Write an enzyme that holds these catalytic residues in place. Structure first.
Site, PDB file in Angstrom:
ATOM      1  N   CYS A  81       0.865  -1.202   0.000  1.00  0.00           N
ATOM      2  CA  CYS A  81       0.000   0.000   0.000  1.00  0.00           C
ATOM      3  C   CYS A  81       0.890   1.236   0.000  1.00  0.00           C
ATOM      4  CB  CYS A  81      -0.980  -0.005   1.161  1.00  0.00           C
ATOM      5  SG  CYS A  81      -0.233  -0.243   2.793  1.00  0.00           S
ATOM      6  N   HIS A 115       2.305   5.677   9.790  1.00  0.00           N
ATOM      7  CA  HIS A 115       1.428   4.553   9.376  1.00  0.00           C
ATOM      8  C   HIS A 115       0.466   4.165  10.501  1.00  0.00           C
ATOM      9  CE1 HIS A 115       0.206   0.890   7.364  1.00  0.00           C
ATOM     10  NE2 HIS A 115       0.969   1.243   6.320  1.00  0.00           N
TER      11      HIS A 115
END
Ligand SMILES: */C(=C/C(=O)OC)C(=O)O
Lengths: 333, 333, 333, 333
Positions: B150, B177
């Site tokens: 991702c 993240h």
């Protein structure tokens, strides 16, 4: 030895007070805060969500705040020029409200009988000092002084060691920052800075900061060579600096580690830390260093382009340096 | 049109499945998971803490999973060689368990009768693709493909645009993240990655990632020119990329803005977004983009040296790019 | 004095070990964990997100874990029957994995030469003890024993004082509880307990607990008069009990506060706490009390129907009780 | 049909506005807020961290806020006596600031030309209503009205079904409540309520609430038979009521499930919900019910003594009841 007064009993005001009693390097004799009366001060100082219960005694006795048996004079004055610092015997005043940061406003404390004033924030016009970087430039002629930001006290000691050794051509800093009193619990009004109004529990929040740029005033050779920005993330305390920087002289990562670990055990001892351990943020909760270099977390692309990582307890590290500066000032009187 | 099977009803499996029905681009007809019974699959797909309750119908009917009326074949097969994807009629298989990422292990889905395998993760040796960056480089000869990470899918479309117009001499990437399924609620065992074991609610956690170095493989001009690392922070979803890079050609910040905005309107529409809004991370929750450039959050030291900010829904953007990839593989059979 | 073995270096295993050295009430001579090596045990023990860095010394030295200079034999045995507890001189073993909670599975430690076993969890068949409540019913005939749950150790001491003084006709308990090692960071698989798989950071999660009904086993007079349930909430540590009970004899809130304060100063000292301070959950982080009555947070509807609030550090409270239970066991051999 | 003005564009003011446009039951024509100018309103309304980005259009156009093509007149008055509601054509004013909850202060809106005022908070003297419970006791004589609190709106409809069918002799209520705008991100001043000052991310925080008692005003038969307290926990939204009650007539759990499901399907539809699913708090985010009874979460000790669990979106449910109450008021004009 020097007798201190604290304007404002916020996180910095209380944690400077806590650091003074723990280190014994200065003596807190007065506190002023117009919105926190004496019993409320007992409670706010005794109990801390981040740094635990005060290890000591704290009580209200005959209109004084009494910590470890030391009575402290309490003022409730919204105007700094009306605080009888000199009556209470407060030689230095820690200006920690965050609203009196100019030399004009912070100077009001000299009216009440205070000799010197340390601003616990960046200042537009007051001379800024960082311990272990440019503190030795202080002299008796400066009566109003700034201890810069927490982020500046993190980047600057690291920047110094890396410049002095390999030379910073240019560097961009990101700080991943713990939440602060200025943010909101749910989406709310933050008229000047719209992102800062958004719910601090739910959001990664990009923010501006002059903390990197400000390294250029404590290290003039780096002036115009550093800037950056911040992400506020949902933790209670402890922040990390991410310095991406080009060096002009070649630097193997082991070399960078060698010089930083040298500085940590020598003159920057207790200001700039060094670790190879597999540390996370809560490992630096109540850690008194300005900066702790994280060997394992950073990464080099080549000999001239590196990413360096340094942790700082934005509350406890900064508060301990405000005490460390006042002790240096008082040694030079 | 193309009939898809999913191995593993994890975060990626359910949201790939969810994005399929929402976009109509492909037809899900099989799920294999051996730890999640059919009744449990109804509940896990119906309720999502991050993305809200599924807008549509989901029921267990006659041993199938029936989503919006489309009955899905359910397998409980611990071993991929033993899944009869062909019988169920699944043209493509999505390999989302995260343990079958090498070409050998992933290939087992062909034994069951599947013709192609999309790996929803980086692969040592399977060819990796990023929609909008090298998806045209895909041809009918390839039967085992990866859709990268991702993070790579956030950095690549931005690196591509920047490198196309200005050239990237070198870059270092930090990703801030959201927590993932591999992390712990409290300090727990993570034998190979000690830091990822530390409580995810309490800590900013530094982490290794190859997502930046991986950008070398979908833009071969950038090979050896990028690396990076990550911080895990206590938010449930949405992540952000912080790309510090040097450009050989002069790029004024308003020039970086014009080109990225222009890309977002043109060939890269719906993959790379552009915004000037005062955004925070939750503004991008369930956003189907790969990468949204954040104009106001980025900062430049000078024309050659820039810090660029791009958001990504690490769950939903990636899951839509797997659906997109499989759609493109079907348009070329 | 008594030499102790710990099976499982999870949250309870390590904090029982930490409590043993801090209190000095027992000697940890041996630890068994098949998933955590010697090196990794140094790190997990030394660094704790919740309770901070270990105060003392921890190193690996010649195959042994050395805490404050005391060497500890490390086993890596999956099968409890095959741990040589007797060769390392472990007289009592703390069964802290939570998978050997029955007297049949817990007995396995007697095979390797241990004399007594304390299960650090409720047990279906093993006799259960709460310090300050029924620990005097323990004698030397008993070899396999349970210290009940952290929630039972909070509820039972308060229930005892309330029942002793006024009589509990009936009661219903809610515990608002911190996140545990069994929950998930993001919506994940929890096949027995579907709510427990939903993301622990995003959610208030209802759960079943037998802890109120178990008070009926440690105070047999309350058998069938208590039950309850729990909510998991996004905090790392510290939980609270909410006891709604009917009282046989009339009790004004001030009378309840007096008898509870009295019990906390007298025979339940160090086990039952008492406070009138404006406390919040983090004020009890690393508090070693089983149960601390919060006088200001409770409320009476009338002289016979009341809601009583009591805090507990579910990690550190329970861990200290396990060491206190073993110390009382040593005194009665 | 009825035209409405909103005083205060905080969580309640924006979400009532959002609920007015989505349900279409009333027309927002005017908004007053002295601290939030027009361009800021477009942002704060458009992007929501909890409820997602607004589904529709919102722009600043010719000094008006235009939502879905409807232009809204924007005042900026600090003193409500000087808002020109009449000239903007606002017939009903929603008083949602939190500081004008007495009949005398909220009455100030009548001086500007408004005909009626709905206080979106409990009132000391204004009559209080809960939709589905006592809203039919409203009449055309009442010009200043309260919509009670989010917690009262959750308890009251459940307490009415239980009391109509089985007889509530006495009840104690706990609500586990998401964080609100009155809390702090880190330990900060809260002079009237010290616990509410402590860091909302780090802490379970007990609090007073009059919500359970206020149920005795909308259901006069339960006057003096209910009270309770609250815990604030670190979630952004969604709260839960925990009602421990004693009944006059016997009620097996299945009988309680039966009559709650019956009232949720019949005359309390859309106000009181009913579910047997393994739900968690996030499954009620943007849910518009006042109250959703969680059958599986509750527990009975016996046929006369039960703990019942009901969820509520404290932001969205309450906001939709404010629109509903104004829809009812317009129908009886
Ligand atoms: C009580 C709950 C907990 O937090 O465990 C670590 C217990 O475990 O005994």
């Amino acid at each position: 030895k020097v007798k201190v007064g604290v304007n404002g009993f916020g996180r910095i005001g209380r944690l400077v007070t806590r650091a003074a009693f723990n280190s014994g390097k200065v003596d807190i004799v007065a506190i002023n805060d117009p919105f926190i009366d004496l019993n409320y001060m007992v409670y706010m100082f005794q109990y801390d969500s981040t740094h635990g219960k005060f290890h000591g005694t704290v009580k209200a006795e005959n209109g004084k705040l009494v910590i470890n048996g030391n009575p402290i004079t309490i003022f409730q004055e919204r105007d700094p020029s009306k605080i009888k610092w000199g009556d209470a015997g407060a030689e230095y005043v820690v200006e920690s409200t965050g609203v009196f940061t100019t030399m004009e406003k912070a100077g009001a404390h000299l009216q009440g009988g205070a000799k010197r004033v340390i601003i616990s924030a960046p200042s537009a016009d007051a001379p800024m000092f960082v311990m272990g970087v440019n503190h030795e430039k202080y002299d008796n002629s400066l009566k109003i002084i700034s201890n810069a930001s927490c982020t500046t006290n993190c980047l600057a000691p690291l920047a110094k060691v890396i410049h002095d050794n390999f030379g910073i051509v240019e560097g961009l800093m990101t700080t991943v920052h713990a939440i602060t009193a200025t943010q909101k619990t749910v989406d709310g009004p933050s008229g000047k800075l719209w992102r800062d109004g958004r719910g601090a529990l739910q959001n990664i929040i990009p923010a501006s900061t002059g903390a990197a740029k400000a390294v250029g005033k404590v290290i003039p050779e780096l002036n115009g060579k550093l800037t950056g920005m911040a992400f506020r993330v949902p933790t209670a305390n402890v922040s990390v600096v991410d310095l991406t920087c080009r060096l002009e002289k070649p630097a193997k990562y082991d070399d960078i580690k060698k010089v930083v670990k040298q500085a940590s055990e020598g003159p920057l001892k207790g200001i700039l830390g060094y670790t190879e351990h597999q540390v996370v943020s809560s490992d630096f909760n109540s850690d008194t260093h300005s900066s702790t270099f994280d060997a394992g977390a950073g990464i080099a692309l080549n000999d001239h382009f590196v990413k360096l990582i340094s942790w700082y307890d934005n509350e406890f590290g900064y508060s301990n340096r405000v005490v460390d500066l006042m002790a240096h000032m008082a040694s030079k009187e």
